[PDB]
């Protein structure tokens, strides 16, 4: 019930979706296919319940963890990238769409946490953590914090947790494990120490979220912050001079952030199989693709290694894609629910102090 001869494309409207109608009329006064795009609001609600029936669109553009269980739901197409294209891009984007062995679709964004700070409440940035509680001392005799986050989320904390033996599942040869979960192990701990020493001489605050974090950070009250893509425009409408770089390592083990890759699945039950992995190749993962695309929304640091030189004059993406090459892939498997579901409780265990951080972390490990 997909047409053949005519590409639909569905993706989300916090994009540049314009810039996908753009790259569609390239390929339409390039070679006369006609390419549509269509944004409305649940796609991935949308996208499983009209595929398992065979029909929807051809593409569509979205976080490679759904993808993976949709490579079970047979709603994902298997694509046949050549090998030199897989030079082109990242390999380590490549990982985000495997499932059983097989390769499901083509990574165009990535996405990192990232460190944002004031350049003038700190000209020189510290590369371990275990500066930050001294600098800290600093900010309390000028009325400042030094850092302040959001601690409700384990997506936050995983950086720092994870970082010198934490893993939240072994993901080996595109493969994930169910019956490990890492969780018990001597790096976590460290990290969860780490963070009750944080807590516990009040660096920072227990009950603290994102808003107050960001918030502050736009009056410039806290100097450091851990943040994404989407909230850079945010700072940005608060003219401070501000920086972007690597998150600092801990005993010599780098961050290790959650990477989520935007990626274009083929529908499973798609006969437009070549047309689309044209638009793709030669049209979509190109430098002038991800150009159209970017001119109305960007997408941070990129998959394709050339417009990766390309966006790597902005210091933001240079940041966002080192965190990205030293962070943890998301996993696409339901299991991942349980998780965030877990370890969550974990921290609530660890901030509250209801629980030691043995007895949080093996709370989380069943």
């Known amino acids: 019930k ?35 795009v269509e944004h409305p609001d649940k796609l991935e609600e949308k996208f499983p319940q009209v595929a398992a029936t065979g029909d929807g669109p051809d593409i569509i553009f979205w976080a490679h963890d759904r993808f993976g269980g949709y490579a ?29 062995g ?28 275990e500066e930050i509680p001294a600098l800290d001392k600093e900010l309390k005799a000028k009325g400042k914090s030094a850092l302040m986050f959001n601690l409700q989320e384990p997506y936050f904390t995983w950086p720092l947790i994870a970082a010198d033996g934490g893993y939240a599942f072994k993901y080996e040869n595109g493969k994930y494990d169910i019956k490990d979960v890492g ?13 009750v020493d944080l807590i516990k001489n009040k660096h920072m605050n227990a009950d603290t979220d994102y808003s107050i974090a960001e918030a502050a950070f736009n009056k410039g009250e806290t ?27 801990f005993k010599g083990q780098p961050s290790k952030p959650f990477v989520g890759v935007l990626s274009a699945g083929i529908n499973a039950a798609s006969p437009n199989k070549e047309l689309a992995k044209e638009f793709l190749e030669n049209y979509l ?9 970017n001119k109305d929304k960007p997408l941070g640091a990129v998959a394709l290694k050339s417009y990766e030189e390309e966006l790597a004059k902005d210091p933001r993406i240079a940041a966002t894609m080192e965190n990205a090459q030293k962070g943890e892939i998301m996993p696409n498997i ?7 579901y877990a370890v969550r409780t974990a921290v609530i265990n660890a901030a509250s102090g209801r629980q030691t951080v043995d007895e949080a972390l093996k709370d989380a490990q069943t």
Not at 185 to 194: E, Q, Y
Not at 334 to 340: D, E
Request: aromatic share 12%.
């Open 2 to 36: 997909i047409e053949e001869g005519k590409l639909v494309i569905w993706i989300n409207g916090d994009k540049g979706y314009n810039g996908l109608a753009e790259v569609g009329k390239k390929f339409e006064k390039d070679t006369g296919i006609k390419v549509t």
């Open 285 to 293: 993962l190109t430098d002038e693709g991800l150009e159209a695309v």
């Open 72 to 100: 079970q739901s047979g709603l994902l197409a298997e694509i046949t990238p050549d090998k030199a294209f897989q030079d082109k891009l990242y390999p380590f984007t490549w990982d985000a769409v495997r499932y059983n």
């Open 223 to 249: 100097a450091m912050t851990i943040n994404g893509p989407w909230a850079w425009s945010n700072i940005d409408t608060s003219k401070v001079n501000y920086g972007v770089t690597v998150l600092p390592t």
């Open 334 to 340: 339901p299991q991942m629910s349980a998780f965030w």
């Open 102 to 129: 097989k390769l499901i679709a083509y990574p165009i964004a990535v996405e990192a946490l990232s460190l944002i700070y004031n350049k003038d409440l700190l000209p020189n940035p510290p590369k371990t953590w």
């Open 183 to 195: 969780v018990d192990n001597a790096g976590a701990k460290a990290g969860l120490t780490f963070l």
